[PDB]
Design a protein around this motif. Sequence first.
Motif, PDB file in Angstrom:
ATOM      1  N   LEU B  99       0.835  -1.193   0.000  1.00  0.00           N
ATOM      2  CA  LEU B  99       0.000   0.000   0.000  1.00  0.00           C
ATOM      3  C   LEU B  99       0.873   1.248   0.000  1.00  0.00           C
ATOM      4  N   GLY B 100       0.493   2.228  -0.815  1.00  0.00           N
ATOM      5  CA  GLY B 100       1.189   3.502  -0.886  1.00  0.00           C
ATOM      6  C   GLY B 100       0.352   4.608  -0.263  1.00  0.00           C
ATOM      7  N   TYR B 101       0.954   5.315   0.693  1.00  0.00           N
ATOM      8  CA  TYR B 101       0.270   6.391   1.394  1.00  0.00           C
ATOM      9  C   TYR B 101       1.237   7.547   1.614  1.00  0.00           C
ATOM     10  N   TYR B 102       0.665   8.719   1.870  1.00  0.00           N
ATOM     11  CA  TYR B 102       1.402   9.970   1.983  1.00  0.00           C
ATOM     12  C   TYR B 102       1.263  10.529   3.393  1.00  0.00           C
ATOM     13  N   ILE B 103       2.365  11.045   3.936  1.00  0.00           N
ATOM     14  CA  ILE B 103       2.368  11.691   5.242  1.00  0.00           C
ATOM     15  C   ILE B 103       3.123  13.008   5.132  1.00  0.00           C
TER      16      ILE B 103
END
Lengths: 205, 129, 110, 373
Positions: B99-103
């Motif tokens: 999974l690719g997520y942004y912070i």
Amino acid sequence: AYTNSFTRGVYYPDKVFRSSVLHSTQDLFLPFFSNVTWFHAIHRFDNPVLPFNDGVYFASTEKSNIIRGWIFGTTLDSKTQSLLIVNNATNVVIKVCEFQFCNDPFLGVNCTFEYVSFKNLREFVFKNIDGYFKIYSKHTPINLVRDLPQGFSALEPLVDLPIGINITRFQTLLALHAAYYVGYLQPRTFLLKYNENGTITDAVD
Amino acid sequence: QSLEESGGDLVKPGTSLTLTCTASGFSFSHNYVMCWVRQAPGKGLECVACIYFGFGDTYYASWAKGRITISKTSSTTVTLQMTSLTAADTATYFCARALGYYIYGDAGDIYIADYFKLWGPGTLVTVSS
Amino acid sequence: DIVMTQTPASVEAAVGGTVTIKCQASQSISKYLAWYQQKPGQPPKLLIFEASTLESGVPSRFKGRGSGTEFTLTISDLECADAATYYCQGYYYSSHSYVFGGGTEVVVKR
Amino acid sequence: CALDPLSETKCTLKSFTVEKGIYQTSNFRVQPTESIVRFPNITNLCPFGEVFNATRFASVYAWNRKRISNCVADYSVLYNSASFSTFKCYGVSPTKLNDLCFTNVYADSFVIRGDEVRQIAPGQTGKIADYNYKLPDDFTGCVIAWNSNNLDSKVGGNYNYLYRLFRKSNLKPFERDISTEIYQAGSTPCNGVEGFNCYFPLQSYGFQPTNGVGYQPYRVVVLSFELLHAPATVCGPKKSTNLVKNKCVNFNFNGLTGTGVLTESNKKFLPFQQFGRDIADTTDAVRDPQTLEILDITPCSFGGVSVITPGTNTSNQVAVLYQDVNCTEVPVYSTGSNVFQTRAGCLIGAEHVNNSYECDIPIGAGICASYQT
Ligand SMILES: *[C@@H]1O[C@H](CO)[C@@H](O)[C@H](O)[C@H]1NC(C)=O
Ligand SMILES: *[C@@H]1O[C@H](CO)[C@@H](O)[C@H](O)[C@H]1NC(C)=O
Ligand SMILES: *[C@@H]1O[C@H](CO)[C@@H](O)[C@H](O)[C@H]1NC(C)=O
Ligand SMILES: *[C@@H]1O[C@H](CO)[C@@H](O)[C@H](O)[C@H]1NC(C)=O
Ligand SMILES: *[C@@H]1O[C@H](CO)[C@@H](O)[C@H](O)[C@H]1NC(C)=O
Ligand SMILES: *[C@@H]1O[C@H](CO)[C@@H](O)[C@H](O)[C@H]1NC(C)=O
Ligand SMILES: *[C@@H]1O[C@H](CO)[C@@H](O)[C@H](O)[C@H]1NC(C)=O
Ligand SMILES: *[C@@H]1O[C@H](CO)[C@@H](O)[C@H](O)[C@H]1NC(C)=O
Ligand SMILES: *[C@@H]1O[C@H](CO)[C@@H](O)[C@H](O)[C@H]1NC(C)=O
């Protein structure tokens, strides 16, 4: 029951400003000297349902605000999503909720979008370009009661709520315990005459 | 939810072979990152290459210089291609889901595909004359 | 450009004992770590993610600690089924790359 | 070709000796000093405090849903706040939510357990992610959550929050189940009476202060960005700037993206008119969006650059002329001691003479230059 329109219904094609420049725009205008349909509501008498056909111009002159809302929708009988405009003294109601209404719905004296904001002559221009419902209005009082006068006036933009619902029909709401005019706009070209303050003072087809 | 591998068999050196994984129970959305993990018989694992559906770009390992190709053929198919097959390619190949997520951070905004959760049985690829 | 050094190559303990797994990051990996249990002929199965969070369904004895370049995994109350090969994988967001460790073999002393 | 104006004249004329006269060599230009992006004030803001700062939260099976539209959604305060334990954005990066608009934003708030926070994401599995709240794999938005032990945990157990244990089929994305009917897990039928194979599908979280971090309550709000054919209702607040006037600055006013120098204007707009225009369909004045006022724009000063020199055999001294440029803006020639001004432009390198002689080199606009003792 037909009546001949007199060089009214011009409106600003866009929010731009222009000083003493005659600018011609190919915009969905109301044709000059077009026989617009006349409707009655007094005495019985009711409001029939009209089509939309790429824009509808409305101009109701009222004494006690008998007109109370507008209906827009392909089905407008809860079968599919449809626009609904309700005008109240308290505020302005816009609903998409699928609702069932009778053939002659009288007002006693899911939702996808929403918004909250014969002397009188509340003019209106109803058009949906790029999914944006733009309503232009003007409220110049009129003394002579024969018909719409031979005069030039524009309709100031009021609301640009996003709708996105294709609209092919149109109905007018009334009040029950009164004549309204409808002229269908046709894509034409006008030579709009902007004043030195930027207000449309005259136009020629 | 399920990942299955196919396309592995005995191949002579110098030719090319294709490997395919199928998405069942989910679709290859932009939020998923797909990578290949290869382990040799009786040896550790290593990442072959990765593809990010969010950007449409693909990262490759250092030991490969144009020898590996990734192409997502459809919403439920992503293919692998290994060229110039040698004895070093004799290993078992797995494919899993990430999974690719942004912070938000002090330096800026970074993309995270940290760990691997669900995998596939894998297909053994053997390279010999 | 990243190497996950895993020491020792194997760990042993009796039933109920404790075995530790030492994983070092050659360059800082921060919080993107995972532990995996793999049996011969069966795909790796995720044990720990974030290096401190238990994956849903795993027993509490699979504990992971550490941050930065020193990564740890301790097993308590060793079971007969715990004999497998364990790996540590650090994800370096700087290069968007995955690197696996050498591997650790678990032996149940009897 | 770039040492002195005489040399710049020689290169263009392609000759070592330059005859006496006025020769155009280059084009003067005033580059934009800075960039300003001015947009209308936030004014009405999206009331994210109604959801985030809500007094009470709904159960996970009965997750509340709020529609956010027709407002500017400020997100700088959201991801900057350190009170949030979880802040994960899927399919979009935290920077661009203040730059991208969407037709609808959904605020979905509920309360779950500490170990169930990871279950709210695309491609997740678990009891919550399958029977209480399912998120699509192509979800565009962010999932935010923060610890709420000091509020949702009560000594002896707070049982106001409930979750579903059993369901025949997995919940579809963005679906709610308030069935609260006696679930069946055996071949024996039932008539809504609790029994051996008849079970209540709803169980309540036990929230106590002494519980662990994984067993502590966590308030979760899911923000769902989505774009349809209908035009967007929620636009992120474009970064406001300081208005600069009388200085050539690149400006972006609600997408005008024009270049020029802005000065306080005089023309009156009608309140509904947003930006002016000239005869030639070139933007000329703009209404300031932050405060209702009028700013006349004029193009960045530019003009021809001419070299007024006698014969190179006669002299090497030259005088430059910048046509249609005010003398103040010229410095943006090394003989800057004397700077004459004329209707033609700014003439650097020469001195005005009160006396009048017959013209040989025409400067422009009635003034002419000549070599003299
Ligand atoms: C009046 O309406 C009729 C019927 O549509 C039409 O023939 C006639 O031209 C109209 N009159 C004018 C002045 O347009
Ligand atoms: C609204 O309309 C119908 C009414 O039956 C409903 O099923 C549908 O899901 C709703 N559509 C949207 C876009 O919310
Ligand atoms: C236009 O209306 C038709 C039905 O008449 C509908 O299928 C279509 O989606 C509409 N398009 C838009 C842009 O609303
Ligand atoms: C136009 O604007 C001027 C501003 O001086 C004002 O005095 C005048 O009344 C306006 N005239 C019209 C016709 O709008
Ligand atoms: C916000 O903009 C309004 C006009 O929309 C303006 O009157 C007000 O001063 C602005 N507020 C601030 C704090 O700048
Ligand atoms: C709650 O309100 C406080 C006080 O205005 C504010 O600082 C804080 O950001 C709010 N918390 C939210 C919206 O989560
Ligand atoms: C410059 O003037 C001198 C003196 O009259 C002459 O000898 C020379 O040729 C002139 N140069 C040119 C380029 O005409
Ligand atoms: C333009 O030049 C004239 C003549 O020197 C001067 O009076 C005027 O102020 C200048 N305009 C500016 C500096 O904006
Ligand atoms: C020309 O004479 C005026 C007074 O008539 C004087 O102020 C000015 O400085 C003179 N010009 C120059 C270039 O000195």
